[PDB]
Amino acid sequence: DISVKVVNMAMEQYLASVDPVADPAAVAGRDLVRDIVQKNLVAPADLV
Amino acid sequence: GICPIREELYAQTFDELIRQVTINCAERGLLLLRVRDEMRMTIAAYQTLYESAVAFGIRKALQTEQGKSEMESRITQLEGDVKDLERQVQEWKFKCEAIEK
Amino acid sequence: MIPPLSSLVRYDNPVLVSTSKLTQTEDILNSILPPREWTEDGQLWVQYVSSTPATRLDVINLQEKLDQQLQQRQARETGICPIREELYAQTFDELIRQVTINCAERGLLLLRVRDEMRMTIAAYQTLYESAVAFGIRKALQTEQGKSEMESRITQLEGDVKDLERQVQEWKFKCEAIEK
Amino acid sequence: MADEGEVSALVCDNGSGMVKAGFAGDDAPRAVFPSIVGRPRHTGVMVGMGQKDSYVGDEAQSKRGILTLRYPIEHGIVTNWDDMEKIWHHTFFNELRVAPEEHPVLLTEAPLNPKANREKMTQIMFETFNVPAMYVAIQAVLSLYASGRTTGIVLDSGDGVTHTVPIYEGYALPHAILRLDLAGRDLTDYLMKILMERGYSFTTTAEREIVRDIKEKLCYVALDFEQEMATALSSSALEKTYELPDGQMITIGNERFRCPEVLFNPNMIGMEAVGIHDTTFNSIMKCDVDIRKDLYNNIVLSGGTTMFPGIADRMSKEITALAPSAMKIKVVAPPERKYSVWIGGSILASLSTFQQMWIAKSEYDESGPSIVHRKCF
Amino acid sequence: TGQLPVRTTTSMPLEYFDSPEMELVQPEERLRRAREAAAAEGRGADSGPVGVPGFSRYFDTSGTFMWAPCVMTDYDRGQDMYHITWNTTGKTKWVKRLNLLFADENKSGFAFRLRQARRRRDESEGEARYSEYVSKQPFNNIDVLDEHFKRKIFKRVGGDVTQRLASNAHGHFEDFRANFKHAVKSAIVDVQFRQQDAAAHLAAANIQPVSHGSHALVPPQGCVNLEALPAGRVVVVNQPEHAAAEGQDWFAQDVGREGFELLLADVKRGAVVGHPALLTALQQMYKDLDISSMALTVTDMRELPLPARLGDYARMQRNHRELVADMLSSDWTIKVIAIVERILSGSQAAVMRFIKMVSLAMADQLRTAVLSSIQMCCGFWKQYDVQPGDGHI
């Protein structure tokens, strides 16, 4: 955060990180990525 | 700029002042009446030509949409051919695969 | 150097501000109706505005001058022509002059009406010009849009020949495999 | 600014559900009309050289029988940009007598407008219109300028769209800006819907404005909807016999309050959504937790539909139920909700801080349409 | 009935004017309904072929116009023309919808449409007569509109726009000169409207006086009324933690017109946009400090040929993430810290809000950067998003 080095300490108070509770865009991105991964885990599964 | 309130109010003022110019002399009142009529006629001609310019602009607003949309359809065909090019790339990959095989 | 052009705005014999090789109202009228001046022979000769009264006879003279000059200048009562516009403006300037001699505040009121209505006219002319310019600009935008979209047509043709060449390339690859 | 007379950037308030226009500096607009465009349906009718190819606004509505009605803007997003160019041309030279070539413009848009939209009007205003300069501000940010303070979530609910724009010291919080799509357009639709229940059909175009103005004038809002059912069943005082010039006794009973209550009970009409109070609540809950305490305490209403008595009463009551005993709420709604953006835009232009905002045409051509990025943040 | 005026082949027809937006329903849909009704009711003798009986031109008896119900077969939308077959008369001819309809159609609305169509016919007839009569008069006016002005506007447009194509489109400008002349002639007619002599001279041709209309009663003030609409209602509901007393948590306030310059000065002294130097400082910080461009995974996989082994994949992404963290998390933090230290030194509530918004602006940049990185990681996995047609082929 700015106030970490404006007053020059190791302050714990940073900008509130991306909350999975209240970021539907991030949650949808997670669902899309995991769905794609599970989709591409099928063809190697039976081709071998 | 342009304001109708000021022009109508000034017209009323000059119409009232015709009384004063007539008190000065009757022939002066007649001359002011005639010149007022003529200059009102001229300003009416000017507003009419302004409305003609308005008509020109409005007419020019919609003289081109026909062709514009008609071959914005052509642009749609263009991105369709781009997709066709993507298909060509895919089939090129498929054929070069057999080449390597 | 500037001969005094014909004008129904009545004037005096040109006065001297260069020589040779009362109440606030006269100052107001002289300021508002500016003298037309020429530097004849390097000495400015200023033609002062008229300041003598007008009577019924003078009104008759100015009316007759209006009527004749409209004819020999071939103005048009109908429509708009600059000849009639400037003649009527000159007659209105004599009216301003005489009403300033009569009652200065009345002349000032005429001056305000005159200022506001000519600025209205100038606004009308400028707005007409702007509207025409905007329409022509839209026409140009259409024309260059047409150019860009015809270039798109050309790009379609290029893509088509690309498709043809790629099909031929696939045919060559298949023939090579068979060989 | 006005040392030799200031040609201020004229305010074109592309409002929530209606279009406003006028000179920046005025206390009220000068041109108002709906966002409807009427194109001549057939070509054999226009014979002569005084033809009108686009009747604008109420001209389109009044002449709809010979015109193709297309609304070029949906929810503050322009769909037919060419139509709006005709609107801009008509607005200037037929409602203000101004020249876009010389008169600067300030542009309004829906909050969180995609910058491609600002880019394309920028290219149209400079290549197709050739404006001298242009600056863009978010509609609700302009609305908050009329709130008297730099902070506030503008709960804008207009005629066709509803927005919640968290703003705190001027710049809008874009992450928590929420938009709802039920407004006076749908309120008119439902008010008609509950009037067929009164034995009088209202769907015709002429009857559309019949209910439209009635909605804008006679619509009050239930402080407690269930209480008003009791009032409706136990009394006929709500049932007013409004009269139209044609002659008819419309009986407006429970319709007097249920239509604006849809803003809090959307599913009564069939539209599936949460109430504006719920949308207002979640929007602030999507903000920074710390600043929320004044955000509810700075709820500002806008939109031309919201003169309805009791709407702020019901809005606060629904908020009061939602808000737990740890909060601080202030629903503000001064009598400029129809015109907060227009007044705010004129206020912003009147600032001498407007001096460091122009997009010069030469700079625009030097930097392309992305100049809106470089001068509007 | 003889309300129909003198109809001429060279006259403007009513077919184009026919309103589709105040008329009840579509004619093709009306015939689909008629066909369904015929199928259901077994029609064919009660109303003949498809279509409920509706009036026609005459009763086949007199020259003047009547309204005679008949029997019709079908209709095609292309020609806007119905086919009919009289009940007692086997004649089969094609008619317009202007006379034909169904008995199920509201006769009140049908009469409404007919009368408004007659009014539109009269209006268009007057307009056409006036336009034709403008052509007769001569002129002596000048035409300021010229190719010089058109080329001036061309060059004023300038750039790649003006000098691209300037060859073919000149044709319309010459006809626009004739438009200028037509407008001048119309203005002259408007001038001749003044004296009764000219007005009575022109009224002998059954032409009615129609004016464009610009001398309307000017309203007092163009400023839209402010307090005419009901005055604004402000309702305040605090909470037991932030209330003032018990029993007045419902604060209702009404305010009339508010000062323009009052709120202008409020914004000027409080808002960042109000503070000139602070405004441009905030602008340059919001615009120049674009940290969302750099992301947290690699899309350039040309350091190693495809396919990619998971080990080098993870190595390159880890190194890139660390390097981007180096340029952002500490670097940009120190930069904005120095910037804030400079700006905050040159109302108290407004200043506190502005600092909170500086912090919220780096928070917004944080959110945008992380969301952009999430979406472009999704795009990294979608670079080979298995589209239909290829089942992992």
PDB file of C-alpha atoms in Angstrom, chain B residues 1-3 50-66 68 72, chain D residues 39-40 49-56 80 82-83 86 89-90 92-94 96-98:
ATOM      1  CA  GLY B   1     -26.271  34.750 -31.148  1.00  0.00           C
ATOM      2  CA  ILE B   2     -29.956  34.189 -31.940  1.00  0.00           C
ATOM      3  CA  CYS B   3     -32.787  34.840 -29.482  1.00  0.00           C
ATOM      4  CA  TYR B  50     -32.013  29.383 -43.528  1.00  0.00           C
ATOM      5  CA  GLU B  51     -34.884  26.879 -43.550  1.00  0.00           C
ATOM      6  CA  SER B  52     -33.868  25.941 -47.097  1.00  0.00           C
ATOM      7  CA  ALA B  53     -30.362  25.200 -45.809  1.00  0.00           C
ATOM      8  CA  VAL B  54     -31.991  23.094 -43.086  1.00  0.00           C
ATOM      9  CA  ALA B  55     -33.902  21.170 -45.755  1.00  0.00           C
ATOM     10  CA  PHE B  56     -30.641  20.652 -47.655  1.00  0.00           C
ATOM     11  CA  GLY B  57     -28.970  19.220 -44.559  1.00  0.00           C
ATOM     12  CA  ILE B  58     -31.882  16.947 -43.665  1.00  0.00           C
ATOM     13  CA  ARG B  59     -32.112  15.651 -47.239  1.00  0.00           C
ATOM     14  CA  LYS B  60     -28.368  14.991 -47.376  1.00  0.00           C
ATOM     15  CA  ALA B  61     -28.621  13.128 -44.057  1.00  0.00           C
ATOM     16  CA  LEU B  62     -30.292  10.115 -45.726  1.00  0.00           C
ATOM     17  CA  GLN B  63     -29.006  10.034 -49.318  1.00  0.00           C
ATOM     18  CA  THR B  64     -26.454   7.232 -48.796  1.00  0.00           C
ATOM     19  CA  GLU B  65     -27.771   4.622 -46.323  1.00  0.00           C
ATOM     20  CA  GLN B  66     -29.040   2.496 -49.227  1.00  0.00           C
ATOM     21  CA  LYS B  68     -23.958   1.896 -47.245  1.00  0.00           C
ATOM     22  CA  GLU B  72     -22.015  -3.521 -45.415  1.00  0.00           C
TER      23      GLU B  72
ATOM     24  CA  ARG D  39     -37.506   7.668 -41.679  1.00  0.00           C
ATOM     25  CA  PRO D  40     -39.779   8.010 -44.739  1.00  0.00           C
ATOM     26  CA  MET D  49     -36.691  19.727 -53.144  1.00  0.00           C
ATOM     27  CA  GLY D  50     -37.877  20.599 -49.638  1.00  0.00           C
ATOM     28  CA  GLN D  51     -37.999  16.977 -48.556  1.00  0.00           C
ATOM     29  CA  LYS D  52     -37.395  15.942 -44.938  1.00  0.00           C
ATOM     30  CA  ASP D  53     -35.545  12.618 -44.768  1.00  0.00           C
ATOM     31  CA  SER D  54     -35.615  12.343 -40.952  1.00  0.00           C
ATOM     32  CA  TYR D  55     -38.383  13.722 -38.744  1.00  0.00           C
ATOM     33  CA  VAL D  56     -36.750  13.980 -35.326  1.00  0.00           C
ATOM     34  CA  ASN D  80     -28.025   3.474 -34.928  1.00  0.00           C
ATOM     35  CA  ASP D  82     -26.058   7.455 -38.158  1.00  0.00           C
ATOM     36  CA  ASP D  83     -29.542   8.227 -36.830  1.00  0.00           C
ATOM     37  CA  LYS D  86     -29.219  13.208 -37.833  1.00  0.00           C
ATOM     38  CA  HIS D  89     -27.778  17.956 -36.882  1.00  0.00           C
ATOM     39  CA  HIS D  90     -31.471  18.557 -36.185  1.00  0.00           C
ATOM     40  CA  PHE D  92     -28.360  22.231 -33.306  1.00  0.00           C
ATOM     41  CA  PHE D  93     -29.862  23.939 -36.360  1.00  0.00           C
ATOM     42  CA  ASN D  94     -33.572  23.432 -35.511  1.00  0.00           C
ATOM     43  CA  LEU D  96     -30.718  26.121 -30.866  1.00  0.00           C
ATOM     44  CA  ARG D  97     -29.396  27.748 -34.074  1.00  0.00           C
ATOM     45  CA  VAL D  98     -25.776  26.777 -33.379  1.00  0.00           C
TER      46      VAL D  98
END
